[PDB]
C-alpha cells in the first residue's frame, strides 16, 4: 500500500481572499476539481523557504486527510506540491470555524440565539461520529476544540454539517494526565470532547472564565470542573461530567458518547410532538 | 368560464385519524392524487343531513380554493361530492395550525424557543405574499389569525412553508371600523395581519392578555394598542404600529408590507455576516 496524494493542476487554481495565517490560508476557486466547473475552495500554503522539517509536517497533514473519508471529516480535494508555495486544497466551509459560527449565532440578536438546542445537539452528534471514525482509524487528535472544526453554511436556517479539521498550551481543553504527565490517549480525547460540547452548548464561551491559564491546572486537580451551561439538559450534563472523570478509564467511549447523544435527541424530538 | 372542482375517486380515500370538528376534519391517505402512490391528506367533511344552506357554504369554500393557486395558499387536492358525507381533500400540513406550531416552539424547552427571529420573519413573509395574492384576486379574508394558517413540517429544523387556510367574535383581531360599523376591507385585513405578525413574534401569545373580551373595544377606541413583543426588532414594531392606524387609509398596503419584511430580512442577514 503506497500512499498517493490527489494532484490538481495549479494553473486551474485562483487565490482570491486571504483568510489568515496557519504558510497562510486563502479562499479561492478551482476548475473541475469534482463538468464541475468553477467551485470555491480553501487553500493552505507552505511558506517559501521554510524549514526542511516544516515541509515534512505539511506532507504528514496531507497524507492523513487522503486516508480519511467520512461525512464529518474535512475533505482534501487536491494538492499542488511541485512548486513553491505548496498547496493543500480543502473543501470550502462557508460557516467558517465552529467557534466563530457559535459566537455569531449568539451575538446576532438579543432577541435570542440563531441556533436552537436541536441545532446544537446535531452539532455534537456530527463531531462524535467524526471522533468514532478517527478512533476506528487508530488516530488520536490531541487538540479537539471548536476552533478546529468547520461548518458547511454561513446562514442559520439552511441544513448544516460540521467536520473535524486541523490535522500554544490549550490548557483549558487538556485532560489532567496530559498536563501533569504528557499522556495523550483516546480517553484524554474524550476529556477534550467534553470541553468541546460545553463550547457548543454555551455558544462558544471560554472555559473556566474566572481562571487565568496558570490557575486552570490548580482548579482542576482539586476536582474543580466547568459550571453547567444555562438550562443545559440534564442528560447532556451527565455525559459531560463523565467525560471529565479524574480516572481516565472511568470516562465513556466515543461509541457510547454517540449513543447518548442520539438517544437524547430521539427523546427530545418525541417530547416535542407528544406535547 | 364555468368553474369545475377537482373530483377524486372516493374508493381510493381512507380516513385514519380524527382531528376535530370544523362536519369533522380527518387525516387520511389517498391513492395517486398527484404514480404518486399513497400520500397523506386532510379531509374536511360535511355532516350528514345538514341544512340546505350549510351545503351551499361548503361548496363556496371548495370553489374559492379551486381558483386560488399560490405557494402560500393551501391546496385543495380533490373533492368527493356525490355521496354523504361530502369530502374536501386538502394537502396535509404536518406542522398543524400556525398557532399550535408557535406554542410548541416556545413551550418545548426553557433553554429557548425552537424558532428563531429569522425563522419567524420568514413566516411573516410567507403570509404577506399570500395576502398580496388574495388582494390581487379581489378577496377579503375577514379572519386573518394564526389559527387559520398551517405549517408544512412538524419539526423545527427542516425547511418550512406557511399557507393561509380557513376560506364567535374574534374581537382581538378585529379593526375598530369592523367592531363599531361592520366595515370589512383590505385595510381592515391589514389591521388583522398586524395582530397576526404580533402572534408570530410572541410565539402564539393571546393579544391583550390583561383585557376581557368586553374590554378590548374600550381599550382600542382610546388609542390603546398591544404592548411590543420582548426584544421585537424596531423595524417590525414600526410596521405593526402602522397596520393599526386608527384611520384605515393611514395603514400600509400588502405590497408595502411584503417590501418592509423582505428589506428587514435582507438587512438582518447582512448584519450577521458583517459582524
Ligand atoms: C469561509 C472561509 N473561512 N473563513 C474563516 C475560516 C474559513 C475556512 C473555510 N473552509 C476551510 N476549509 C478553512 C477555513 O480551512 C482552514 C485551514 C481552517 C481549518 C480549520 F479546521 C479551522 C480553521 C481554519 C481557518 N484558518 N483560518 C485562517 N481561518 C479559518 C476558518
Ligand atoms: C397534521 C394534521 N393536523 N393536526 C391539526 C391540524 C391539522 C391539519 C393539517 N393539514 C390540514 N390541511 C388541516 C388540518 O386542515 C384543516 C381544515 C385546518 C385548516 C386550517 F387552516 C386551520 C386548522 C385546521 C384544523 N382543524 N382541525 C380540527 N385541526 C386543524 C389543524
Q: What is the DSSP string of chain B?
A: ------B--GGGEEEEEEEEE--EEEEEEEET-----EEEEEEEEE-TT--HHHHHHHHHHHHHHHH---TTBPPEEEEE-SSSSEEEEEE--TTEEHHHHHHHHHTT-TT--SS-HHHHHHHHHHHHHHHHHHHHTT---S--SGGGEEES-SSSSS---EEE------GGG--HHHHHH----HHHHHHHHHHHHHHHHTTSPPSSTT--HHHHHHHHHTT--PPPPTT--HHHHHHHHHHT-SSGGGSPPHHHHHHHHHHHHHHHHHHHHH-
Q: Which three cell numbers stand for residue B124?
A: 411573516
CB proximity list for A203: less than 8 A, separation 6 or greater = A102, A103, A105, A106, A113, A115, A120
As a whole number of angstroms, the distance between CA A95 and CA B272 comes to 12
Q: Which three cell numbers stand for residue A161?
A: 454539517
Q: For residue A4, is the peptide bond before it cis, meaning its omega torsion is within 30 degrees of 0?
A: no
- Using an 8 Å Cβ cutoff, are A172 and A206 in contact? yes
Closest CA to A9 of A42, A37, A32, A26: A32
Question: Strand pairing partners for A14?
Answer: A29
Closest CA to A57 of A49, A46, A73: A46
Q: Do B233 and A269 touch (CB under 8 A)?
A: no
- Using an 8 Å Cβ cutoff, are A129 and A70 in contact? yes
Judging by beta carbons within 10 Å of its beta carbon (0-12, 13-18, 19+), is residue B218 exposed, middle or buried?
exposed
Closest CA to B198 of B210, B189, B207, B190: B207
Judging by beta carbons within 10 Å of its beta carbon (0-12, 13-18, 19+), is residue B181 exposed, middle or buried?
exposed
Can you state the angle between helices B254-274 and B234-243, rounded to 10 degrees? 170
**CATH, range A10-91:** 3.30.200.20
- Using an 8 Å Cβ cutoff, are B167 and B65 in contact? yes
* Residue corresponding to grid cell 459582524: B275
Judging by beta carbons within 10 Å of its beta carbon (0-12, 13-18, 19+), is residue B101 exposed, middle or buried?
buried
* Residue corresponding to grid cell 410548541: B104
Chain B nearest-CA residue for A108: B272
Q: Which three cell numbers stand for residue B39?
A: 400520500
Closest CA to B131 of B119, B144, B121, B147: B144
Chain B nearest-CA residue for A106: B272
- Calculate the dihedral angle through the C-alpha atoms of A161, A165, A171, A174, rounding to the nearest 10 degrees: 80
How far off is chain A from B140, nearest CA to CA, in Å? 32
Q: Do B116 and A117 touch (CB under 8 A)?
A: no
As a whole number of angstroms, the distance between CA B184 and CA B167 comes to 15
Instruction: Considering only the beta carbons, identify the residue of B110, B118, B156 that sits closest to A118.
Output: B156
Judging by beta carbons within 10 Å of its beta carbon (0-12, 13-18, 19+), is residue A29 exposed, middle or buried?
middle
Chain B nearest-CA residue for A202: B111
Q: Which three cell numbers stand for residue B106?
A: 416556545
Q: What residues of A are designated binding site for ATP?
A: 19-25, 44
Q: Is B274 left (phi over 0), alpha (psi -120 to 50) or beta?
A: alpha
- Ligand 1 centroid vs A34 CA: distance in angstroms? 20
- Which residues of A are known catalytic residues? 143
As a whole number of angstroms, the distance between CA A133 and CA A73 comes to 9
Q: Is A32 left (phi over 0), alpha (psi -120 to 50) or beta?
A: left
Q: Do B271 and A118 touch (CB under 8 A)?
A: no
Resolution of the entry in angstroms: 2.2
Q: Which three cell numbers stand for residue B151?
A: 405549517
Q: Which three cell numbers stand for residue A66?
A: 487522503
- Using an 8 Å Cβ cutoff, are A135 and A188 in contact? no
What contacts 24+ positions apart, CB below 8 Å, involve A102-110? A102/A146, A102/A199, A102/A200, A102/A203, A102/A204, A103/A203, A103/A204, A104/B272, A104/B275, A105/A156, A105/A203, A106/A203, A106/A204, A107/B275, A108/A156, A108/B271, A108/B272, A108/B275, A109/B117, A109/B231, A109/B233, A109/B268, A110/B231
Chain-centroid distance, C-alpha B30 = 25
- Calculate the dihedral angle through the C-alpha atoms of A87, A91, A93, A97, rounding to the nearest 10 degrees: -50
Instruction: Count other Cβ atoms within 10 Å, centred on residue A231.
Output: 11
Closest CA to B173 of B144, B197, B149, B201: B144
**Among all ligands shown, which has an atom nearest to the Cα of B97?**
2
Q: CB pairs below 8 Å between A and B: how many? A: 79
Can you state the angle between helices A186-201 and A254-274, rounded to 10 degrees? 30
- Using an 8 Å Cβ cutoff, are B59 and B79 in contact? no
**What's chain A look like in SS3?**
CCCCCCECCHHHEEEEEEEEECCEEEEEEEECCCCCCEEEEEEEEECCCCCHHHHHHHHHHHHHHHHCCCCCECCEEEEECCCCCEEEEEECCCCEEHHHHHHHHHCCCCCCCCCCHHHHHHHHHHHHHHHHHHHHCCCCCCCCCHHHEEECCCCCCCCCCEEECCCCCCHHHCCHHHHHHCCCCHHHHHHHHHHHHHHHHCCCCCCCCCCCHHHHHHHHHCCCCCCCCCCCCHHHHHHHHHHCCCCHHHCCCHHHHHHHHHHHHHHHHHHHHHC
CB proximity list for B207: less than 8 A, separation 6 or greater = B172, B173, B195, B198, B199, B226
Q: Do A116 and B112 touch (CB under 8 A)?
A: yes
- Calculate the dihedral angle through the C-alpha atoms of B191, B197, B200, B202, rounding to the nearest 10 degrees: -80
As a whole number of angstroms, the distance between CA B240 and CA B197 comes to 8
What contacts 24+ positions apart, CB below 8 Å, involve A243-252? A243/A190, A243/A191, A243/A193, A243/A194, A243/A197, A244/A191, A244/A194, A246/A176, A248/A175, A248/A177, A248/A183, A248/A185, A248/A187, A248/A188, A249/A187, A251/A187, A251/A190, A251/A191, A252/A190
Domain ranges of chain B: 10-91, 96-266
Q: What residues of B are designated binding site for ATP?
A: 19-25, 44
As a whole number of angstroms, the distance between CA A195 and CA A208 comes to 10
The structure was resolved experimentally with: X-ray
Atom of ligand 1 nearest to the CA of A74: 12
- Using an 8 Å Cβ cutoff, are A145 and A192 in contact? yes
Question: Strand pairing partners for B149?
Answer: B164
Instruction: Count other Cβ atoms within 10 Å, centred on residue A16.
Output: 11
Closest CA to B135 of B164, B160, B162: B164
Return the best residue to mutate from B15, B16, B22 for the ligand 2 pocket (most ligand atoms within 8 A of CB). B22
CB proximity list for A275: less than 8 A, separation 6 or greater = B104, B107, B108
Q: Which three cell numbers stand for residue B53?
A: 344552506
Closest CA to A20 of A127, A79, A72, A97: A97
Question: Strand pairing partners for A7?
Answer: A79
Q: Which positions in chain A touch B112 (Cβ < 8 Å)?
A: 112-113, 116-117, 231
**CATH, range B96-266:** 1.10.510.10
Q: Which three cell numbers stand for residue B250?
A: 393611514
Amino acid at each position: 500500500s503506497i500512499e498517493n496524494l490527489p494532484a490538481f493542476p495549479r494553473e486551474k487554481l485562483t487565490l482570491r481572499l486571504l483568510l489568515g495565517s496557519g504558510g497562510e490560508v486563502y479562499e479561492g476557486t478551482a476548475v473541475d476539481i469534482l463538468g464541475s466547473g468553477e467551485i470555491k475552495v480553501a487553500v493552505k500554503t507552505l511558506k517559501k523557504g521554510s524549514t526542511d522539517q516544516e515541509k515534512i509536517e505539511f506532507l504528514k497533514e496531507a497524507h492523513l486527510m487522503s486516508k480519511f473519508n467520512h461525512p464529518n471529516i474535512l475533505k482534501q480535494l487536491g494538492v499542488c506540491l511541485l512548486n513553491e508555495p505548496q498547496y493543500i486544497i480543502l473543501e470550502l466551509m462557508e460557516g467558517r470555524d465552529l467557534l466563530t459560527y457559535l459566537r455569531k449565532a449568539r451575538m446576532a440578536t438579543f432577541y435570542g440565539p440563531l441556533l436552537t438546542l436541536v441545532d446544537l445537539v446535531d452539532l455534537c452528534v456530527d463531531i462524535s461520529k467524526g471522533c468514532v471514525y478517527l478512533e476506528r482509524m487508530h488516530f488520536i487528535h490531541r487538540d479537539l476544540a471548536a476552533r478546529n472544526c468547520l461548518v458547511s453554511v454561513k446562514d442559520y436556517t439552511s441544513p448544516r454539517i460540521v467536520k473535524i479539521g486541523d490535522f500554544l498550551l490549550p490548557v483549558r481543553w487538556m485532560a489532567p494526565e496530559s498536563l501533569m504527565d504528557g499522556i495523550f490517549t483516546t480517553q484524554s480525547d474524550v476529556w477534550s470532547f467534553g470541553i468541546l460540547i460545553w463550547e457548543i452548548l454555551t455558544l462558544g464561551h471560554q472555559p473556566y472564565p474566572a481562571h487565568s491559564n496558570l490557575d486552570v491546572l490548580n482548579y482542576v486537580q482539586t476536582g474543580g470542573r466547568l459550571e453547567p451551561p444555562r438550562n443545559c439538559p440534564d442528560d447532556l450534563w451527565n455525559l459531560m461530567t463523565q467525560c471529565w472523570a479524574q480516572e481516565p478509564d472511568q470516562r465513556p467511549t466515543f461509541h457510547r458518547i454517540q449513543d447518548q447523544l442520539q438517544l437524547f435527541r430521539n427523546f427530545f424530538l418525541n417530547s416535542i410532538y407528544k406535547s
